[PDB]
Amino acid sequence: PIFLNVLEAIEPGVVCAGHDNNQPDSFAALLSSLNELGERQLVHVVKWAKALPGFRNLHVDDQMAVIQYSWMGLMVFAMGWRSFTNVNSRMLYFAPDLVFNEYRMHKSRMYSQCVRMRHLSQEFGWLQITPQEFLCMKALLLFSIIPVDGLKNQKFFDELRMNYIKELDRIIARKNPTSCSRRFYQLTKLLDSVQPIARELYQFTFDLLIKSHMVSVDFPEMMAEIISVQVPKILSGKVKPIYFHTQ
């Protein structure tokens, strides 16, 4: 299975946030650790994306674009999976050194978002998502959010996305077509559910960036730039998710 072989081969390892668990939880400490984790994971997302079949055939400006728009969804989905596989969705496993119980969900001031992410995590159990389905789905999330006015080379993006949809379909395909159809429906619905969550997190981090000096939250280099230049394009509707089903 050439494609799946590649996805498993390139899958990033464990990333720690660097969080001090010996200190009492505070809003500022938790969010500063999340922001650092974001920066660390972004580095891994770039190295991963570059190794995905067909990715480097995109225009370099489109490579930049998809990474800068898709990262929240990619990272949320992966965290949901870690949470499912490591703690049966009981807590949010952001990193081995940054695990959110309900108290931290409250302290973070992102409780509503956390609950939705935990629901997402539970869906991996409820649907019995396989590791191989997870890998293909995550890859597809990189190609699930683009500018409304299209990319630099839309045709190449369209072919790439089409081929990642095909690979997911093949992983699903089960003698009975009705089971394959129900499965594809379930998984595309799950994929779609990532985007509203990512949007709420995008809103939160944008607002937090705008007031970060007031609340003592540190944003690293790339994250602060992405959140001020790219994220508002999502928030203003210039960049939108590609949904399977209508919202």
Binding site: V43, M64, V229
Partner: peptide, 13 residues
Amino acid sequence: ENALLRYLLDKDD
């Protein structure tokens, strides 16, 4: 243009 991100994308490592 995000210079730091483009560097990561351009970098072989």
